[PDB]
Design a protein around this ligand. Structure first.
Ligand SMILES: Clc1cc(C[NH2+]CCCc2ccccc2)ccc1-c1ccccc1
Length: 326
């Protein structure tokens, strides 16, 4: 008959109960100004469909973040802009300040509030058990907020989290893969970055929701507390599920695929194997024990679950004893 339908346990109908204008990005009218008002300072990053810069607004001598969009599908550009406008100002969300276009290139660019990012490959120097809890809570504020606004990020990873450690300022960025959640909609599973893909994407289960972001979050937490980047190190999309199965076990994987009546790809036949469920304590060592606690492990166990419905929602995660200290 096919896979069993599923829907989010929270914010299920938030979009259904709103007007067409809020979620119909294909019909949204994008109006941009002249890029002549901005001068590029330095490169911050580079993506598949973008290049991020530090820039100066010449009319007020204020630093900004400028994201130059590589002309991809116009609906994709429209989706991101609509999403950014809907979320503009939300807690720990990158704030869109302006939309422009260079007169000569006709290339569209997005202008954001300035964030002074501290180096990722040089942040763990003074990043304590408290720091991790504090920044994890800041990400959860962003997540409950965008989820409450009927949006799933679908690309949660360290590269999409900007941290200004001196001011304890965090921003969830790159809303280019984000999408409006509509219950029963079937989404393209070719989202998120390989190491952060939820089991739903890997088993080609299209009816996923907000909980996909909570699996990605769990991946980030595990790499941070265990000092193992990435935590699930797949070499391809099929191998990624094997790496998760080596930790969560194959019994609970079949239990999940049986629950939703998912049919596994033949590519999994020769590689999946048989694996027992491991204890989270197995990943503790001298180099990471100062960041691990029974609270951290309990919180992690409730995020990294095959069953997307069994994972904590962002609002439930904020109530976990791991955050009592913050
Ligand atoms: Cl979420 C995060 C991000 C980081 C650092 N991001 C690097 C972003 C670089 C960049 C890329 C593109 C444009 C602008 C800048 C370091 C640690 C964490 C972290 C904290 C607590 C728990 C787990 C992880």
């Amino acid at each position: 008959s096919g896979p069993v339908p599923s829907r989010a346990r929270v914010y299920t109908d938030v979009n259904t109960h709103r007007p067409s204008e809020y979620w119909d990005y294909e019909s949204h009218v994008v109006e941009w100004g002249n890029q002549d008002d901005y001068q590029l300072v330095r490169k911050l990053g580079r993506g598949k469909y973008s290049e991020v810069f530090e820039a100066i607004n010449i009319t007020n001598n204020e630093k900004v973040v400028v994201k130059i969009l590589k002309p991809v599908k116009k609906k994709k550009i429209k989706r991101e802009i609509k999403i950014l406008e809907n979320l503009r100002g939300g807690p720990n969300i990158i704030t869109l300040a302006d939309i422009v276009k260079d007169p000569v290139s006709r290339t569209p660019a997005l202008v954001f509030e300035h964030v002074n990012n501290t180096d990722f490959k040089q942040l763990y120097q003074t990043l304590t058990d408290y720091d991790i809890r504090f920044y994890m809570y800041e990400i959860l504020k962003a997540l409950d907020y965008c989820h409450s606004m009927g949006i799933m990020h679908r690309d949660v990873k360290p590269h999409n989290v900007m941290i200004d450690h001196e001011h304890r300022k965090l921003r969830l960025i790159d809303w280019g893969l984000a999408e409006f959640y509509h219950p029963g909609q079937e989404y393209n599973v070719r989202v998120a970055s390989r190491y952060f893909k939820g089991p739903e994407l890997l088993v080609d289960y299209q009816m996923y929701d907000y909980s996909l972001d909570m699996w990605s979050l769990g991946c980030m937490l595990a790499s941070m507390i265990f000092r193992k980047e990435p935590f699930f190190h797949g070499h391809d999309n099929y191998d990624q599920l094997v790496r998760i199965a080596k930790v969560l076990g194959t019994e609970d994987l079949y239990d999940y695929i049986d629950k939703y009546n998912i049919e596994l790809d033949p590519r999994f036949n020769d590689i999946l194997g048989r694996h027992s469920r491991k204890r989270w304590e197995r990943f503790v060592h001298s180099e990471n024990q100062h960041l691990v606690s029974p609270e951290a492990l309990d919180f992690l166990d409730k995020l990294l679950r095959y069953d997307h419905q069994s994972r904590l929602t962002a609002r439930e995660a904020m109530e976990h004893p791991y955050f009592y200290t913050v």
